[PDB]
Write a protein that binds this ligand. Structure first.
Ligand code: PEB
Ligand code: PEB
Ligand code: PEB
Ligand code: PEB
Ligand code: PEB
Ligand code: PEB
Ligand code: PEB
Ligand code: PEB
Ligand code: PEB
Ligand code: PVN
Ligand code: PUB
Ligand code: PUB
Ligand code: PUB
Ligand code: PUB
Lengths: 102, 260, 164, 177, 177, 164, 164, 164
């Protein structure tokens, strides 16, 4: 049982290692994708609605969506879909970085 | 490499006397602390025992240039001296043993000295580049170089040399200075070339005088037993009774190896 | 710091002689192989972070007892020291690919590492697990050109033989 | 020290004439075979330490008289000199692969080693066994047929060069014996 | 000792980062300039002994105080050490042309030479004169404008590299002075 | 006998280390420059006799006092020694072009020549006159390929700097 | 093989002088401490088997990865090599307790062990785990006399500092 | 200046190694034999004057030709140099009994004495006569313990073998 459990661990640390690392790369990828902005067409779909919520509940960014009336949330009334830009765009988040070590 | 059994005794005894001169107290002196980590004297031992086979692997011509030049310079080390003429001319291992014994009991080397200031130091780079020139008679390196033989031995060798300059910084004033005058004598005598301005250079710098050796440039090292084991199963070479200098150069006159 | 230049210049300096035609052929070989080496250096400086990330993740994927209790990485800090060390070794492979010899990788990374690794109880086999993962990981052409792939394998194998 | 070029030159000096056509033709085959030689040397020198480890551990595996007390492989200092000598032998064989001629191996390592190992009591038969294991493992790494490493290279013919490396290891095995 | 490559790498270690794009760009200019460097080194190394002869003979022929009794060139053996030192200086400058970086010349030859020639009583100004004559003759042979040798090479731009070699000789002339 | 191979093998042997990638770059340079050198060697072995003939004829064309009385070639035999010596030097230029370094030319022809030449009263400037005539006489396009001509000039210049 | 005898005899032999009074005091110290050391040697040769058994069992109790499919004891044979090695180290501690110095333990066991251990991919920390278990194992008075225990601890600690 | 301490510390320093258990046994021997040696040192510093007086008186009692004309003590001053020298040798025996080795007695008194004694025409046999008188004179227990006397005899015999 001891020798054969130790025989078991090998063939699994290969695939288990690859699966974990793939989850980490995907994590960074999704977070940067949500940070870059969500287009109108994506925000209409369910996935864009719950990804906008994902960003809100997790304090990653604020993503402008649609006002309760329906007209797009603008800061300045000239151009649609603006957001407030200051001092939080410039603070780096730990979820963007692949490398936690440096 | 193998030396006749008459030789190993003579060279070993000579070694023991120059060790007695170099250290009379028996409290082991500064000059042979050998190593500062504990892996260090072992690795030094193995490198030195392997070097001898690397000296036996040289071409025959270079071996005989070594051999006769050690004979000549050994007589120059005798000071006239007809009896040690006879004993030195008859046995070639013992000649190089006597050269390195005298030069190392008199504390001759730049390994024992410290240059201070740029003038003395460059002078050493010049003298070294003369001997490094004299070893390598082409761009091809000699087979006598051998800093390591595997990986990572060479870095240890770097650590010995770097650890040995500091001991040169450590010696007492009395010792530093007996080194000065003694190195003067080693240069002015072992060369035996009465120029004015050369002896002015040796007058100015004993560290120029420190790096004085055979024309080839590498002092033949002395080893207790070249390629002879400690294991029971030693086959020793059965040496013939006549032996002139070419015969330990060329290793003719060995015959079989006999003993369990 | 060994390269072709320091080898032939140090050799001809040792002869005390002007550099003959053979040294010139050697450096002309350096400027032939330089294209593949600098390609691999550009690409390594491209994606070094993901290389170090997968390297360290595979390193703890193999040996788990390091992250268990004891005499090893038992903090996020020490695992950050781990990924910093793998950052150093990839930085040295980058430098040795720029120079083209094993020079800076030897005299900066390899020399005297053994007393440090036996002193701070760092097992070298974990590093070896990381590097073997990276060498197995890179495809012949997807990651980089084949000539450069070969060069990268050579350097990384040298690290493993220095460390095993 | 002699490469293939110096062997052609010294043989031409034995004939005491110029170089000629056919010798240069064999030399052109060397230079066209050049990158196969380079890649072969890269293969063995890459997998070198692992070759030495497997070779000496296998040599010990065949007969345990070496590891028995009173054997030459007994204790660490002896075993260290053993592993060290395996590394040295592999190094000079790799030199003989770069040079293309065995004269470097004949002068630097081969000359005066049988008498030496007889003098120390090193069993020479066991050393020839270790050289044979290095031969097999080295041909296996040089033909990309190793069961632990499969490096990727453009496929081709390299059997002649495998015969060269096998000739050098057989020179060592017949050298200590 | 440092070539161009090692200088890029050590500077990158001072910045403590990876090598980078611009440094590799300057290195690509080096490698594209490679055969010009090789042919330039072949030019100076070919005409080297004759450069030394003319340079030191011209050095004496400016001021005859050297050849006067009591001067430092006054005997055969002093003159032999003089021509020997000229050959050595030209050798390390040729090394600096192959390496592309002056660190070989800084470490092997330059370090501790002024205090040496001051300690011997060698007039350093006359040595700087000889280095200047080797500079002019060396640029003349390196630009194929010598009046005694006209070698044939495919024409191109080599003025930058002439500025490099002139920088090394000015490093020596400012080194003894 | 220096070439690229003996230089890098001797260097790495001196380090006690395996041949790394840098040595491999150097020998790969040797197998790049090999084509030009072997071309020049084929052509030299083509017309060595006419080269030696014009060389010796120009050699006595410059210095006539050798053939006048005294301490030099005063026979048909000694002029045959002359042309045989030029045969030797062209044979060594052939060898050094085959090997690719100045190795066999140095260790056979150059080393120790100066005691012989000062002993037997042989003035070296006549040899130099022959080789310069030969160097000047060579035309790149007519005689051989241009890259090859450079190699030949290099070797012959080396002879002159060894002898002057 | 260092002891008091070989140190003072080798020192006075290095002086070329007869052994003075100080050497005599030193060997008289050896024959004072001999009683405690030989007591511990008798007891070690008493129960060496149980010592090696609990040592190896604790050695695999700490590191279990050793038994992984590649790179350590992956047979009953290699674990027999393990227990044989711990038999060797206890045999050397017995020898060094007989001699009284670290001589045979050093020149048989310690010297050159590091290249073997880095070559064969055997971690040293497992040995260290075994020896620390044995040293933590023995009470000063129940098993053996108080004076001997100190001597045993000293020797075993020397092994650890040689190996860490 | 040799003692147990300088021998073992100089030896272990020569090895570059920490002081092992053997050195510790040696110094523990020094602190065992110290009681007898310091007893004799206390008693020598007790009655050194009468020792030197009877020593010198026996020295001129044996050889009278010194005090006769010639090449020796021919004054009260030179006989005061005599008694002063015996004061020095008893002071060195005191020092060597404090240290426990022949160190200060050798490096202060013995070394280079032979050129001085052959130069100033000083015959060594008179010193030997004095020391043999002192060694014959001392009783087993009158001014020192039985064990202690042995130590004194040893030191004084060393002086005689240095001087004969
Ligand atoms: C840094 C300072 C420094 C020096 C002062 C010299 C000193 C020196 N001279 C020689 C070597 C020599 N020196 C001389 C000189 C002499 N010829 C004679 O007729 C006179 C007695 C004497 C000049 C006054 C000769 C002839 C040799 C060669 C000796 C030989 O090979 O026989 C050598 C051995 C290496 C060589 O052959 O060059 C050295 C170290 N070298 C240095 O590096
Ligand atoms: C220039 C190149 C270069 C390197 C390659 C490193 C190598 C290195 N690592 C450490 C030091 C360290 N390295 C590690 C790394 C490890 N953690 C583990 O779980 C793994 C076994 C391993 C990562 C794979 C740890 C944990 C330490 C700290 C060890 C300790 O303090 O216990 C040290 C000592 C100094 C320090 O504490 O930082 C050095 C020199 N440093 C350099 O300068
Ligand atoms: C400089 C060195 C260097 C390496 C060693 C690689 C390593 C590497 N490979 C991948 C990523 C990858 N590597 C491969 C390669 C393949 N997968 C297979 O199943 C095939 C067998 C094999 C080709 C022979 C593939 C398919 C991916 C993407 C998906 C994956 O993870 O497998 C990634 C993630 C980024 C990406 O998707 O590109 C990284 C860092 N990259 C580098 O820059
Ligand atoms: C340049 C080439 C070159 C070599 C090929 C070696 C050859 C060589 N090996 C040893 C020495 C040795 N070689 C071995 C090796 C062996 N152990 C065994 O169990 C096996 C029979 C065998 C490995 C297959 C051992 C054990 C020693 C030490 C022998 C001893 O001291 O008893 C020595 C004596 C010096 C020394 O102790 O290192 C030499 C010259 N050295 C060189 O310089
Ligand atoms: C500086 C380092 C250095 C190397 C390591 C080699 C690497 C190398 N190998 C080849 C090229 C090759 N390499 C091999 C080698 C073999 N193929 C097989 O199937 C066998 C497994 C193996 C036996 C050795 C073959 C067969 C070729 C192609 C044939 C040839 O070019 O001669 C090429 C040609 C260019 C290319 O393919 O892109 C190069 C550069 N050359 C160098 O300059
Ligand atoms: C590695 C680099 C390196 C150098 C650059 C030289 C530098 C150098 N030159 C001399 C020594 C000398 N250098 C010269 C040269 C001179 N003659 C003159 O008329 C001019 C002023 C000048 C040439 C321009 C002379 C004449 C001597 C001998 C001086 C003397 O003995 O009086 C010496 C002392 C040793 C010797 O005598 O050779 C040294 C170290 N040596 C080296 O090792
Ligand atoms: C192994 C030895 C070795 C050499 C010695 C060089 C020789 C060399 N030089 C050039 C080629 C050249 N060489 C020069 C050099 C110059 N032209 C001038 O007018 C200046 C006088 C001089 C300054 C240095 C130029 C300008 C070219 C052509 C431009 C170029 O190729 O960059 C070429 C290109 C191929 C050809 O032209 O046929 C080669 C092989 N390369 C080598 O591999
Ligand atoms: C020659 C070397 C040598 C050793 C290193 C010991 C090691 C050792 N100890 C025990 C056995 C034991 N060792 C101890 C000792 C103690 N347990 C405690 O909790 C206390 C802290 C500590 C006393 C200070 C005890 C109590 C046992 C019996 C029960 C147990 O296993 O703890 C046993 C099993 C046999 C037995 O019961 O005696 C062995 C092999 N024996 C040897 O012969
Ligand atoms: C540190 C230890 C130490 C010593 C042991 C002495 C030893 C000693 N004694 C003398 C010197 C002397 N010692 C004696 C003594 C002798 N007179 C005799 O009749 C007897 C044979 C003998 C006493 C037993 C005499 C007479 C001299 C002077 C000799 C002379 O000048 O002729 C000298 C030369 C210097 C001098 O003149 O003082 C020295 C070094 N000095 C030391 O520093
Ligand atoms: C003669 C017995 C004796 C010896 C052997 C001795 C000291 C001694 N010289 C030794 C060696 C040693 N000493 C020298 C210097 C020697 N060579 C020179 O050119 C100069 C002028 C020297 C004067 C002795 C070298 C080059 C070496 C070999 C280098 C090396 O082995 O690292 C050693 C070995 C340990 C070490 O590396 O320092 C020792 C212990 N002191 C002695 O009295
Ligand atoms: C052939 C290549 C070669 C050497 C060089 C020596 C070097 C050497 N010296 C040793 C050890 C050693 N060395 C000395 C110092 C030395 N002895 C003296 O009595 C005086 C006056 C000294 C300086 C002149 C001492 C005092 C020792 C301790 C052993 C002893 O008691 O002599 C040891 C033993 C190391 C160990 O214990 O691990 C070695 C290997 N051995 C070799 O194989
Ligand atoms: C201060 C303490 C100290 C030393 C002692 C040296 C020792 C030393 N020599 C080396 C390496 C080395 N050594 C030589 C041999 C040597 N050179 C010659 O030209 C001749 C004639 C020689 C024998 C007289 C050669 C040929 C090399 C290879 C480098 C080169 O081309 O010179 C290397 C490089 C090792 C490596 O590449 O890993 C070292 C460390 N270094 C130090 O720091
Ligand atoms: C039980 C005691 C024992 C051993 C220990 C082995 C040792 C061993 N290895 C061999 C030979 C051998 N060994 C290796 C190297 C090895 N394989 C790899 O794929 C990798 C990565 C390696 C290092 C980790 C190779 C590559 C070969 C050639 C055979 C092959 O293709 O695998 C051979 C065949 C020898 C011959 O052909 O004459 C033997 C005997 N055998 C034993 O009976
Ligand atoms: C009458 C006493 C006397 C001399 C002797 C010469 C010496 C001399 N040569 C010079 C300089 C000089 N010398 C040569 C080398 C030389 N030319 C060649 O074409 C070949 C093949 C050469 C070796 C045979 C070159 C190449 C130059 C550079 C000038 C040029 O382009 O020719 C210079 C100029 C120095 C300067 O620029 O500061 C001088 C003074 N002059 C004198 O007044």
């Amino acid at each position: 049982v001891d020798s054969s459990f130790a025989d078991f661990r090998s063939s699994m640390w290969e695939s288990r290692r690859e699966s974990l690392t793939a989850q980490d790369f995907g994590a960074v990828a999704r977070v940067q994708r949500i940070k870059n902005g969500l287009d109108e067409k994506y925000l209409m779909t369910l996935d864009g609605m719950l990804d906008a919520r994902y960003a809100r509940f997790q304090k990653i960014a604020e993503p402008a969506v649609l006002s309760p009336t329906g007209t797009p949330m603008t800061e300045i009334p000239g151009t649609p879909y603006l957001g407030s830009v200051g001092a939080m765009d410039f603070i780096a988040q730990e979820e963007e970085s692949v490398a936690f070590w440096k | 490499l193998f030396t006749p059994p008459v030789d190993e005794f003579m060279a070993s005894s000579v070694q023991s006397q120059y060790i007695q001169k170099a250290c009379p107290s028996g409290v082991p002196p500064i000059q042979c602390i050998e190593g500062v980590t504990s892996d260090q004297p072992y690795a030094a031992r193995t490198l030195k025992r392997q070097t001898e086979l690397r000296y036996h692997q040289l071409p025959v011509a270079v071996k005989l240039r070594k051999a006769y030049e050690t004979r000549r310079a050994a007589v120059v080390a005798t000071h006239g001296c007809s009896h040690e003429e006879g004993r030195v001319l008859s046995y070639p291992r013992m000649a190089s043993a006597m050269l390195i014994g005298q030069a190392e009991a008199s504390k001759a080397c730049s390994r024992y000295f410290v240059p201070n200031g740029p003038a003395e130091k460059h002078m050493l780079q010049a003298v070294e580049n003369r001997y490094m020139a004299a070893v390598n008679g082409s761009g091809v390196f000699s087979g006598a170089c051998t800093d390591g033989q595997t990986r990572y031995e060479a870095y240890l060798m770097q650590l010995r040399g770097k650890s040995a300059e500091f001991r040169a910084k450590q010696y007492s004033t009395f010792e530093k200075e007996s080194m000065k005058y003694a190195a003067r004598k080693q240069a002015l005598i072992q060369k035996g070339h009465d120029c004015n301005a050369e002896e002015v250079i040796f007058s100015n710098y004993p560290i120029v005088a420190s790096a004085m050796r055979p024309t080839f440039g590498y002092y033949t090292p002395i080893v207790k037993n070249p390629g002879i084991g400690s294991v029971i199963n030693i086959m020793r070479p059965v040496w013939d009774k006549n032996s002139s200098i070419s015969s330990p150069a060329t290793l003719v006159g060995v015959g079989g190896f006999v003993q369990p | 710091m060994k390269s072709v230049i320091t080898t032939t210049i140090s050799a001809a300096d040792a002869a005390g002689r002007f550099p003959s035609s053979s040294d010139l052929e050697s450096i002309q070989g350096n400027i032939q192989r330089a294209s593949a080496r600098l390609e691999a250096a550009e690409k390594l400086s491209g994606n070094h972070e993901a290389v170090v990330k997968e390297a360290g993740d595979a390193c703890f994927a193999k040996y788990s007892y390091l992250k268990n209790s004891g005499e090893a990485g038992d903090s996020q800090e020490k695992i950050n020291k781990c990924y910093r060390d793998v950052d150093h070794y990839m930085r040295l492979i980058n430098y040795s690919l720029v120079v083209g010899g094993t020079g800076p990788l030897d005299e900066w990374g390899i020399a005297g590492s053994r007393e440090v690794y036996r002193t701070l109880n760092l097992p070298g086999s974990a590093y070896i697990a990381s590097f073997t993962f990276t060498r197995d990981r890179l495809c012949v052409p997807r990651d980089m050109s084949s000539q450069a792939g070969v060069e990268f394998v050579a350097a990384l194998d040298y690290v493993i033989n220095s460390l095993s | 020290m002699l490469d293939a070029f110096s062997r052609v030159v010294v043989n031409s000096d034995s004939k005491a004439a110029y170089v000629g056509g056919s010798d240069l033709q064999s030399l052109k085959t060397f230079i066209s075979d050049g990158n196969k030689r380079l890649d072969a040397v890269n293969c063995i020198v890459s997998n070198a330490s692992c070759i030495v480890s497997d070779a000496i551990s296998g040599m010990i595996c065949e007969n345990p008289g070496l590891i028995a007390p009173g054997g030459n492989c007994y204790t660490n200092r002896r075993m260290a000199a053993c592993l060290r000598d395996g590394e040295i032998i592999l190094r000079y064989v790799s030199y003989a692969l770069l040079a293309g001629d065995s004269s470097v191996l004949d002068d630097r390592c081969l000359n005066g080693l049988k008498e030496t190992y007889i003098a120390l009591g090193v069993p020479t038969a066991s050393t020839s066994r270790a050289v044979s294991i290095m031969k097999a493992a080295s041909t296996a790494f040089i033909m990309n047929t190793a069961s632990g490493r499969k490096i990727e290279i453009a496929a081709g013919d390299c059997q002649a060069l495998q015969s060269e490396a096998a000739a050098y290891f057989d020179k060592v095995g017949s050298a200590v014996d």
